[PDB]
Symmetry: C6
Subunit: 98 residues, 6 copies
Amino acid sequence: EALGMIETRGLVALIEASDAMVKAARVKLVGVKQIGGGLCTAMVRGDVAACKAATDAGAAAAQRIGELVSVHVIPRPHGDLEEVFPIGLKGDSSNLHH
Amino acid sequence: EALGMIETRGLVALIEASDAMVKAARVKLVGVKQIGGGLCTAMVRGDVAACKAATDAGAAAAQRIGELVSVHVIPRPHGDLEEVFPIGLK
Amino acid sequence: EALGMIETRGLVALIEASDAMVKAARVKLVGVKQIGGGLCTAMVRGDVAACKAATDAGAAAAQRIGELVSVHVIPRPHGDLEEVFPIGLK
Amino acid sequence: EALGMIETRGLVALIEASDAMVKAARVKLVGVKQIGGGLCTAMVRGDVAACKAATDAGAAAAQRIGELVSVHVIPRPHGDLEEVFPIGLK
Amino acid sequence: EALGMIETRGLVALIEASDAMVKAARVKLVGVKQIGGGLCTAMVRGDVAACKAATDAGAAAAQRIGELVSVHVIPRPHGDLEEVFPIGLK
Amino acid sequence: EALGMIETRGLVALIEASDAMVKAARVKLVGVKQIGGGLCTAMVRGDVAACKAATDAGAAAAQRIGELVSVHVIPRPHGDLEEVFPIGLK
């Protein structure tokens, strides 16, 4: 699956984009993270062409209400990019152990 | 049933808003928040019209005692939203 | 009972105003929450007027110690505000 | 019965401050604190005047190393301050 | 082995780097620390030749997606570095 | 024993300097720390001239990858500093 994300400086701006994203296309919202500075990021997985459209509409709704800084998509997430980023669906590592 | 929120720089603006918000219409305050930064956000959920009123009161009520950043209401939050954001009635 | 609250940008100013605040008149320091940002805020609850005297003086003493962001008071803090901000009696 | 503080933008400017304070006079360093924005505060307790020499010396040692933002001292802190502020003797 | 890292302002730029790093060459992505004002840093470890191919590609691909604040590889970090920084093979 | 320390803004910068720092003279990296705004420090102890040279190399190594806030040495840390700062050998 593709990785879509947008990062905003300003939460409210973030939630709105997350709303429009998951509304735009067939993409789930595998979570969000903030890292200080007021910067904070939301991330989604889906059909590549889904995550493309969602982010696109995400950036829109974001610019409208707040300060959007960056948006980007990644058709080919590195496998091991996960054990390190909230980019995960729950592969049930722990609920997978039983 | 709907979701209104406002984003400040300044806690004291955010608390004033909250207060105008609930006090302005029929909408329960479901989450405050922070993102490092000095920025933090308050949340409410009620009738579409309810949230627009309180949002309107808070934005204004904060305009006066500090920095306002953002107001918005989302009439019909996508379900996915809630599992991620502090946005539900517990 | 009313709610007084001051907010600054620097802990020193802050613990300073709270000290006037509590010294000025009939009020009790009840919470302090930090947004990081270098913004920090204190909270006290007296009879409305005891929170005006109290604040007024707090912001003063603060400003000499440096950078102050907000002062404000709310005589009748909406009820469910308590359950979301460190404003509560205890 | 004397409470000296220093506030810096930068840790190494504060670890210096404290080092000179404890050294200058007979005041007991009862805790550090940080509040985002790279601001943080060192606290010390002693003889009123002893807090004055110690502050004057530590403030001054930081102004050389870097970013100094606050130096104050309260000879007679309310008791409310202890239970909320980390100035506690321990 | 060698240790290369990239530091960004922005998590997104960051996430892209790592992804282009782990792709560019024979390197294992071993860490991501994070600090204030949204600077987050990313660790990797491999052939010193290989930590170059990667830091170069990860530096680049961030460049276009946002704010890069530093690239560097250390061929042979001291053993100390290990016990005080997220570099270690876990 | 003394104390060398070299504060930054930017982690990667701080890594290179802890490395070279510990690589310059004989000294022990006793620990690190951040306090927001993305300032952070490393802290080592060793024979006092150890620290002079090491700090001094970390400062150069640092001045280049990124931005350096503070270097300093305090040959004779007041024993008190140590129960409040990540300064000790544990």
